Design a binder for this molecule. Sequence first.
Ligand SMILES: Nc1nc2c(ncn2[C@@H]2O[C@@H]3COP(=O)(O)O[C@H]4[C@@H](O)[C@H](n5cnc6c(=O)[nH]c(N)nc65)O[C@@H]4COP(=O)(O)O[C@H]3[C@H]2O)c(=O)[nH]1
Ligand SMILES: Nc1nc2c(ncn2[C@@H]2O[C@@H]3COP(=O)(O)O[C@H]4[C@@H](O)[C@H](n5cnc6c(=O)[nH]c(N)nc65)O[C@@H]4COP(=O)(O)O[C@H]3[C@H]2O)c(=O)[nH]1
Ligand SMILES: Nc1nc2c(ncn2[C@@H]2O[C@@H]3COP(=O)(O)O[C@H]4[C@@H](O)[C@H](n5cnc6c(=O)[nH]c(N)nc65)O[C@@H]4COP(=O)(O)O[C@H]3[C@H]2O)c(=O)[nH]1
Ligand SMILES: Nc1nc2c(ncn2[C@@H]2O[C@@H]3COP(=O)(O)O[C@H]4[C@@H](O)[C@H](n5cnc6c(=O)[nH]c(N)nc65)O[C@@H]4COP(=O)(O)O[C@H]3[C@H]2O)c(=O)[nH]1
Ligand SMILES: Nc1ncnc2c1ncn2[C@@H]1O[C@H](COP(=O)(O)OP(=O)(O)OP(=O)(O)O)[C@@H](O)[C@H]1O
Ligand SMILES: Nc1ncnc2c1ncn2[C@@H]1O[C@H](COP(=O)(O)OP(=O)(O)OP(=O)(O)O)[C@@H](O)[C@H]1O
Ligand SMILES: [Mg+2]
Ligand SMILES: [Mg+2]
Lengths: 47, 50, 240, 239, 22, 29, 483, 489
Amino acid sequence: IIEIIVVCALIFFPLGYLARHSLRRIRDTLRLFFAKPRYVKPAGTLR
Amino acid sequence: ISDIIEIIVVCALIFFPLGYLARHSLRRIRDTLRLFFAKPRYVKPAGTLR
Amino acid sequence: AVLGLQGVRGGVGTTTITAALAWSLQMLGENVLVVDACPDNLLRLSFNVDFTHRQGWARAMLDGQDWRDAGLRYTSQLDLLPFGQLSIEEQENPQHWQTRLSDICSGLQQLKASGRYQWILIDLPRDASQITHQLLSLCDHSLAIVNVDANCHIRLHQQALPDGAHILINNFRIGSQVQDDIYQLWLQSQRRLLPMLIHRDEAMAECLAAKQPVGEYRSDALAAEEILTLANWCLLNYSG
Amino acid sequence: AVLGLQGVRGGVGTTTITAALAWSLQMLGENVLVVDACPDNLLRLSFNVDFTHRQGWARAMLDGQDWRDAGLRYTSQLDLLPFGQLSIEEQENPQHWQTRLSDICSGLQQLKASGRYQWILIDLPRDASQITHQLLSLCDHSLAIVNVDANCHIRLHQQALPDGAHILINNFRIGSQVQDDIYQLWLQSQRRLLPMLIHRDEAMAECLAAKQPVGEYRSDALAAEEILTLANWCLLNYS
Amino acid sequence: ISQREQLAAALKRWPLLAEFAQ
Amino acid sequence: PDIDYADISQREQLAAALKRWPLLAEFAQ
Amino acid sequence: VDPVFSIGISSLWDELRHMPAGGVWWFNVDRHEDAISLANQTIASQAETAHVAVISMDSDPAKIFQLDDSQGPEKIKLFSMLNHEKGLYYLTRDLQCSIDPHNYLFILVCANNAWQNIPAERLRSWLDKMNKWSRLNHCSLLVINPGNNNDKQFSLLLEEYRSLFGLASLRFQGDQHLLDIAFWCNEKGVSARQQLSVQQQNGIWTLVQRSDEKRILSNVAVLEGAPPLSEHWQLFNNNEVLFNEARTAQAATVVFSLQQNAQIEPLARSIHTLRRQRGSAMKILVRENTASLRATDERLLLACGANMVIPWNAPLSRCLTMIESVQGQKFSRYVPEDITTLLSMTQPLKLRGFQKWDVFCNAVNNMMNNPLLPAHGKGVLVALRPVPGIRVEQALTLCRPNRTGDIMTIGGNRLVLFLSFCRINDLDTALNHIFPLPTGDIFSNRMVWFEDDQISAELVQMRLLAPEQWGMPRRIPEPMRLL
Amino acid sequence: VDPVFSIGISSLWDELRHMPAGGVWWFNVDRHEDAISLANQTIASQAETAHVAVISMDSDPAKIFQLDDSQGPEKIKLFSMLNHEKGLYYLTRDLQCSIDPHNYLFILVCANNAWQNIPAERLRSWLDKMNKWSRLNHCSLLVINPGNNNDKQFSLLLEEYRSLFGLASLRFQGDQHLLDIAFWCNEKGVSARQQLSVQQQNGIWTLVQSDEKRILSNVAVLEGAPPLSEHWQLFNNNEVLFNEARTAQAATVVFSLQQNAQIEPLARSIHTLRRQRGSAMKILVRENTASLRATDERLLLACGANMVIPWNAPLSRCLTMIESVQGQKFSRYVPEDITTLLSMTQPLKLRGFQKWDVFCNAVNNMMNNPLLPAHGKGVLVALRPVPGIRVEQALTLCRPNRTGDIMTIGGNRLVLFLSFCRINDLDTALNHIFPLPTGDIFSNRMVWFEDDQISAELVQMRLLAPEQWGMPLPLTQSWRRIPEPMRLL
Ligand SMILES: Nc1nc2c(ncn2[C@@H]2O[C@@H]3COP(=O)(O)O[C@H]4[C@@H](O)[C@H](n5cnc6c(=O)[nH]c(N)nc65)O[C@@H]4COP(=O)(O)O[C@H]3[C@H]2O)c(=O)[nH]1
Ligand SMILES: Nc1nc2c(ncn2[C@@H]2O[C@@H]3COP(=O)(O)O[C@H]4[C@@H](O)[C@H](n5cnc6c(=O)[nH]c(N)nc65)O[C@@H]4COP(=O)(O)O[C@H]3[C@H]2O)c(=O)[nH]1
Ligand SMILES: Nc1nc2c(ncn2[C@@H]2O[C@@H]3COP(=O)(O)O[C@H]4[C@@H](O)[C@H](n5cnc6c(=O)[nH]c(N)nc65)O[C@@H]4COP(=O)(O)O[C@H]3[C@H]2O)c(=O)[nH]1
Ligand SMILES: Nc1nc2c(ncn2[C@@H]2O[C@@H]3COP(=O)(O)O[C@H]4[C@@H](O)[C@H](n5cnc6c(=O)[nH]c(N)nc65)O[C@@H]4COP(=O)(O)O[C@H]3[C@H]2O)c(=O)[nH]1
Ligand SMILES: Nc1ncnc2c1ncn2[C@@H]1O[C@H](COP(=O)(O)OP(=O)(O)OP(=O)(O)O)[C@@H](O)[C@H]1O
Ligand SMILES: Nc1ncnc2c1ncn2[C@@H]1O[C@H](COP(=O)(O)OP(=O)(O)OP(=O)(O)O)[C@@H](O)[C@H]1O
Ligand SMILES: [Mg+2]
Ligand SMILES: [Mg+2]
């Protein structure tokens, strides 16, 4: 009931905190995944 | 059962941006607290030596 | 009307002023005929006439030809009647031809009636000859051209000006104490003085060099404007 | 001896130059007599002769008197023979008295043969009169006075100067373009032109007002020095 | 009065004007 | 009188004077 | 822990050579080829475990950049961007998207005069953003800039020294290149205002182990009999051996001498060769002794690499003061590699005589639309209205052009003249040169067009004239009878 | 907009002295008394409107820190803290609590070996925080650390060049303090690795400390044109040039003469220079339009000038002659009295016609003066008139123009003495003193331009009967004149 709801706070409030603390990591990973190069197009790593 | 799951989801949803704004505005909160009284310890002003 | 110009002394500016006045009166939308009776024949050369041109009314009558064929058309409203050149034998013996030129008066009279020209300006010398007297008598009005110097001051008090002529001051200079004194004396000693005077303007000296009237050669010069004022005065006062 | 000054065109300054030349020569120690051949009688007024003095050689000849009594002595070395003021009627009809002045030529010949006068200046008119032709004929030298302008330049190519005359420039300005052009053309074309020229000076316009020759009026005047140089030149060449 | 004084001064200065003046 | 109009066009200043004023050139021909 | 990277210069001390990761370094180059060779030699210069990201513009990076088969890192990243400001702005995000940009090397090689279009404030902002991005990412960026007129940009870079961590410039000087290190900071200390000379051997840079700025090289005819004016004064007979000695010169002053018309082209070529072989440190001055120069020739010399051409009207020591004026100054203006395009601008019309209305309009419009001409100084268009009593054909007869660029056309009771490269002030002189009679007695009114827009408007207004109105080649008193 | 502050060092260039607001600078010293003095000098070196806050440890700053009563800001505010690391960590917050950090300078005075217990990593983090804080708040922080063995810490500071806007060291060396600036940054550039010495004098740290080719000329010597070379020094007028000349010993001096009135002062000055600064000097005169005759040129030459350049010669030839006089000592003698030279320029002082005895005596005296050049004193000319005119008339025909021209009449011979004239330019003088016809007036002339010839001619001229001595016509010949009638016969 109320106790379990409060317990959910002791999980999601710290989640929101650590998730925000890794904001740069999340942004970097998302940019890696989606991969939108608008103007700088890698021609290819040469040997 | 179903209502319990719904309420848990609702609580999680309300509390995620709660901590998101807690971290986002943490610097401003600390600054305001410093402004109010804080605790100006250690370094102490001696006087205005004119 | 017939306006006769004669100077109290040779070389005061009678011919130059005659040419300038004829040019100005013509520019005011009027037919003008200017006749040179002075034998020196220097009025032609102000109107871009070739020096070798010896034709003239005096010469036309001296050769028994018609004097009327010697006319020239300068502009649509200005005419010339050159005197003509005289030989050195003719120049050194003026009595042999002075009395043979009397017929020109009747021709001038019949022209004055022809109604063609609204002004008949005559350039006359001061030789006190029969021709000069007859032509001065023919003129309806007269203009005496003088300069502000001792010589003309004496001549005004020892020689007879034309009957009712107006004294026109020419070649007024700058910074001459004697000139100012004589002008002051004339301001109350002389009653026939015209209100307008022509200044010593380099344009007048150059105009004969350029074989043009001073009005045409340089209309912005002071002399051209003064001659314009004189032309207006002739219109307003010498109408009849 | 008999140095006749004649103007190419009236108003160049023949009379004032003649008076100045007489005064300059009399300063140089020569016996000078000036005889006015101009009927307008302006030469007398330049030697402090009153305007009322009607006597003159031409009037004396017309009236039958002796012209020898018509003279005035200005200084110990300068004598004047004025023409004499004529009546208005006489001026109106010059042909009634032009032919009656023949004896003046014989009188001037007698004065020249006298030797009392080492210089006899004559101020002449330009009217083509018989008397003036005779007077030029008796003249030993002639000076034609011109001014640097279009009028005199035009005249010099169409009117006959006396034979042997020298052209003198009077009323020379400063900074007149047409005048300078005519002067250079005259220098490079006119053979008889004299080396001296007389600048315009208020002294020459003021000399007649004071009834004095320009030399006596102001000896420091530039025109006075030019006239003195001309007098010396005449002494050197016209003697 | 300026013109008359100037005229008198000139007449005194130049005797030719004074001769014809009176 | 005595006029020597020959060999006039050999001088620059006289040439300019003749060019400026028609009367002088008219006499000089 | 983070490795340091080395610039690709042989015989260079580590103080000015090491670049620790976490900063921004800027390099300017005089020529594109020297920049690219420096890029390749930096490419071979990194260690085996070093990671390099290379950015290219307006070409394929896989075709122009190579790697040595013996030395260098195992693998480097070749990136291609459009020659636009947005690519440089997005560089950080675009590199993050495909690369985790921590402890990585970044080489920035741009096209020729690519940085000229970037505004100053935005350039400062981009530098600050790059600095923060690099410091946070602990990565290093190398900027290799071929440029000619970056003096204001160089002043900006000096004003932004906090954002940067090292600034150097390379100057071509005929046979060697000068490395001018304004400041360089690394893990081994800080150096400020170092000048060094380096040389290239088969596409390889070597340091050679300012000096002739004071020396003045001049022609004998420049000083009209004046001896050598100081110890730093040398005189040469003609501007040929002077050219050879200036080939050896680095920062001296060369004063050419102009006597005749024919000297212009060889002098133009020699100045072009010097300004291409040797950079802006040279001070090139052209002394005109005799009035045998056109304004277009002076513009040609200015474009060839001459600081200024001293007019013949000025006296000698005024020319010496002109020499003293360019002291401490660098020729920042751009000189095209091609020289023939410079001489083609001397006379682009080459048509003389009478021209028809259509032909004249076409020629003037073609000359006006030529991009390789000075603005508002291509020529002067004059319209003449003849005085009453004379026609346009008579005026056309009394009109004789003297230069190559003159064209004439009569139409609609009006005579049109076009003078090539003539200036507005010096128009009456040209008119007097062309017309035999003085201007003023032949025409009553004159309209003058000298600006590009005004001349174009006049041309397009003249074209709206119907045919049959075009054209092709003191009062005298008369006798009359008075009645 | 933000003011730029300065370090308290005397005789220091602004490159190593200016400290823009918004940066961190570190100073290391050898002595704590030297640290206190430097801190106090920094305090008193600031402007009136400058805002300064002071942070010190282990002492009361109110008693140990002093301010000058004549220079420095109106007031400063101090801060006292225990010798602890936590104060250094919290410095930013503690200063923000009491002071708005915008446009403020903070001095961090530390105790002896205070920075010994701070670890390297925490020191780096503290420096980074301070740098970011200063950039955010646009404030400058000064830390003065008294220490002896901070070599490792100094190396760490060198490695922290990103967060440090300047690192300097000051070490005691017996009599002077050596200032070694590893790197410095300000608004006027960046300097690195400089070693300087400063000395402590009465509480002020002060930084420690032929003309054969220099060319001295008037600016008018180069019309419009600025100097040829570096040694070429221009002067506005020929008095500042003269005044500078009192310091030269062998320099090349070129004066400018544009008017004749400026001849006497120029000659006198040249005399003074030749009499004062030895014979190693070279004096030159350069005309501009026309300012000298022959006699004045000789006056200048005797006054001390080695060479005079005529106005005809172009400037290039002027510089050429300048370079030609290079090896030329002035070996002539210059008298003490300039009055002799000034008198030499004109010995006659009488003009116009004179009596025959007067003419003879004056000419003889001028020819008897020892202080005149030989055979250049003047020309004695005898003119015999063309028989057309006499001699008094010829006298009336000549108007001499100069002071030294005199004339007489005697024995049908008008004599002219043109003082200071050459034989070649005799005709020019005669044309100037006569009408245009050059000597056409007279028949023959006899010219004597040598001293023996002139003296013998004078002796011959003295042997004349006084009866043939003339007088001018204008004076002898000479109110209004009234004509009197007379008969002509
Ligand atoms: N007074 C005057 N006349 C001018 C001027 N421009 C052209 N002319 C006249 O036009 C003729 C032909 O000049 P172009 O067609 O430009 O053809 C010219 C041109 O190609 C060349 N040239 C002459 N002077 C110069 C110069 O100063 N610079 C250059 N670059 N070429 C020159 O020599 C050719 C023949 O010229 P010229 O024999 O002198 O003959 C010249 C000259 O009589 C000018 O500014 N002033
Ligand atoms: N179409 C045309 N335009 C003309 C002509 N003469 C002058 N101009 C124009 O007027 C300007 C002044 O030329 P300048 O006073 O003769 O001064 C001229 C002249 O003294 C001399 N010069 C150059 N080329 C020639 C040439 O071919 N012949 C002569 N005689 N002089 C030349 O160098 C100067 C060069 O003048 P710019 O700087 O080009 O500038 C010239 C040009 O724009 C001409 O004959 N035709
Ligand atoms: N007594 C006398 N002698 C004369 C006169 N005119 C010329 N000379 C003599 O002739 C020489 C040449 O002078 P210049 O050709 O007129 O050339 C002169 C002239 O251009 C100028 N100059 C000198 N003094 C004066 C002066 O007082 N006035 C002017 N306007 N120029 C002067 O300096 C030049 C050099 O002349 P000098 O060295 O004096 O040397 C003079 C002098 O010996 C003169 O009026 N009186
Ligand atoms: N061409 C020429 N003319 C000469 C010469 N000597 C004298 N004159 C003439 O004589 C006038 C009087 O000069 P000054 O009595 O020597 O008295 C002179 C003299 O003291 C001085 N001065 C003028 N020019 C010069 C010059 O070039 N050198 C010197 N030393 N003094 C000069 O100014 C006074 C007035 O001279 P100016 O007003 O020019 O007027 C000068 C000039 O017209 C000469 O050598 N050449
Ligand atoms: N106002 C004036 N200003 C300047 N020059 C003038 C002026 N009036 C006349 N002149 C000049 O005076 C000279 C003589 O004038 P002009 O020949 O017309 O007089 P004139 O009395 O007709 O002479 P003459 O009858 O003797 O031929 C000319 O050169 C003329 O240009
Ligand atoms: N060189 C001169 N400078 C200034 N004024 C002069 C000069 N020469 C003459 N004049 C003036 O010119 C005028 C004419 O002089 P003058 O009376 O002698 O003339 P003229 O040729 O004899 O003829 P007329 O007697 O008919 O005037 C006088 O006012 C005189 O003062
Ligand atoms: Mg007339
Ligand atoms: Mg008279």
